[PDB]
Amino acid sequence: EVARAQAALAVNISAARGLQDVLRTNLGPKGTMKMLVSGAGDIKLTKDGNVLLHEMQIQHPTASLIAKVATAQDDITGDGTTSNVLIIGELLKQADLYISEGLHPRIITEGFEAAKEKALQFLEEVKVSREMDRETLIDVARTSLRTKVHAELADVLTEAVVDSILAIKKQDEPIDLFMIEIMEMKHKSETDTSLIRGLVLDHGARHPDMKKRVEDAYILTCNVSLEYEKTEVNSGFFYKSAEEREKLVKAERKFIEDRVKKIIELKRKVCGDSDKGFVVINQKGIDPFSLDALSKEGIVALRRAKRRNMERLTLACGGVALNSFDDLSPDCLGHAGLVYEYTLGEEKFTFIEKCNNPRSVTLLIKGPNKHTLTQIKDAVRDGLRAVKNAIDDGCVVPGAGAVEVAMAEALIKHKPSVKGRAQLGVQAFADALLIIPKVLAQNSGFDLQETLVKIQAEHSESGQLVGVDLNTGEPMVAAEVGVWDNYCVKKQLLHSCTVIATNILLVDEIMRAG
Template structure:
């Protein structure tokens, strides 16, 4: 029975190889079969993770099959280079130079876990920013330029269209938008008041400018390539008044409960 099983496996493994092949399997491959494949010039990788198999299909094309009986040239993917690197104490197999990739892997290296986590967060933020830009098909000027321009528009245009206490609300909302350039200036060690006055002066002249964190001077964000995501900025503007309203509502509830405790 052992000999018959060995013969059956060998028949599946052995084949004439005129091209370079790589076999990647989610399950195990016994050492004799690995040896036979290696003699035929076929790289065999075993115990691959399912998510890696799914990414390989997106990167290289082809399809994953459950049986060698179903294996035909139509199911094969293509890659220009498959090689193995030893990084530290771990072995990594790189599949490179694919023709039409829809997936890729970014290998992050660092001296400690904290550094790797920081790099990973930065990569994720960058990818999400690109994704938002593609979906929104729009961007907003960064470096605090949008907030100062919005503040000027609210004070000079919108405030004139309302009457009574609503004007105070518009003015308060407009001043709240200046928090972003103020924080940028504080984090850069700049004088907040001087920066805001200079930015507002430029906007009054019709120049939509932002803050240079190195020099504290106004800059053109578009020329410097500084932009923010439209969807993120919209969400912040929408959620800000909602959060403020909820906090005020909590204060009213606390005051009401205190008044109810007082004796009549």
């Protein structure tokens, strides 16, 4: 089935609004949560632009296509997908108005670009270069989390955020694929958000009371089999050879009490005492009687580890990996100044913490363990990438539309071309910018018009960046307020908004066929 040109563009642009409109608070603290019980057919909770897209099975190509490119920003920033959709269809709103009056679909698409630049130039012009301190990042943390959750919820979150990235700023790595270690915990309340500069150990050893508080953590991350297995196992396993099974029964616990002694000696080599804590972590099962020997030596000897955890163990501690405990120097195992083996609920989740040279920082959250407990985890985690951009860009500008008008102003305040031709594109282009504050202000309050003429005249009067009180509808200096746009975030979605809006303006038919 087919729709041509004008009829093609409608289904495009018509599909945007309602879709787009649901997000009219996805951004800032005013952002309204949205629940899928319908996405796969499962009860959930989400606010993000790109995420909500993929979450819902989204039947319409319009809904379909941006989520692909909306994946880019959510890949990059993680938010502003919470935003970008809004300008996009409003932009789609603008171009048709010409073609509605009539105008060639080309030139409008054509007139967006110098517009896409002169506004992007204004980004260069407006971008506020800021020297990032934890506080600056605190308000960078809360501007993305307000977009996510309560500013209340943004609070306990903000700490671990700016603190986790705080130790990666040490690493001078502008991006974080580490200190992204996050933990969720059994609780009545998702309120708890915990920060472990080290790791947290999911698995407990089948033997409790081994070393329950490991003070000095000497961690050999060990694939080792200290359970080879205790009885008849041939290669370590059952088989069809009795002849081999007849030979292979005894060396098992021998190869084990080896690795027992290999730890026994190791412990006393690592320690010579049970005072200094000590840890063994098997990637596999361990004999508990091995443990029993070892649990009484001052070790916490752990088993069936997850190779992922082994890394941050091998790394954030500076831990190490062997197949034979042998003996290793006490220092030869990575370290965490304290280890706290911690049971909430019935499972001890061992905190290997202040892991020496942490490249990873663990963020625990205790919660009801619902998609509530999810709605918090996702919330911080894109703000992480957001605040990560503030590491990336030294330029962070405020949000809450403080940007938009002043940006939308110039190219409107003057035809950037002084072409009607481009201004056709531009007036279409430069207009859609205002969608964010004007709905949010009116989402929270009075009609856009006032705040608009406020924020404009204000910026016109100020040039200070003034932005909505996102639960009021009144403009406030958004820099000081702390609602803040990475020059990373806003610039990209800007591009993202326009770069899609063109060739999709250019779909002059669609056939259903393939």
